[PDB]
């Protein structure tokens, strides 16, 4: 409602740009619950190298509980193309949206906008 994030998403400075809308930590499967069946997942790619498959294992956990599924991606790495390609293939099968940010503020913006 006024968002629900996972306490496993703390630390992440993107929460610092979630200023225009109210948000709070809740125990939910996805990273952010934005509506009764809309939910997002954050994957900082740079971290994507450091132990990946987690984003893959993260979508199977979510399964199908939310209608609008979205993947917030922070492009914090040069020459990202390669990964985006294999991540996108994953999203069509998972039928979730692929969104691209490049800063912790930009993604933070993407959150105020989906609840707005």
């Amino acid at each position: 409602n006024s968002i629900i994030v996972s306490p496993r998403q703390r630390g992440n400075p993107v929460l610092k740009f979630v200023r225009n809308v109210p948000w709070e930590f809740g125990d939910v499967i996805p990273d952010y619950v934005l509506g009764q069946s809309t939910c997002a997942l954050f994957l900082s790619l740079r971290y994507h190298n450091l132990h990946p498959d987690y984003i893959h294992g993260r979508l199977q956990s979510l399964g199908k509980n939310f209608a609008l599924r979205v993947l917030l991606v922070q492009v914090d790495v040069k020459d990202p193309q390669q990964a985006l390609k294999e991540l996108a293939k994953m999203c069509i099968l998972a039928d979730c949206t692929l969104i691209l940010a490049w800063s912790p503020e930009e993604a933070g913006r993407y959150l105020e906008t989906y609840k707005a």
Partner: peptide, 11 residues
């Protein structure tokens, strides 16, 4: 610090 926990995000 550098304690990358879990959550698709570098820490």
């Amino acid at each position: 610090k550098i304690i990358d926990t879990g959550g698709g995000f570098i820490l």
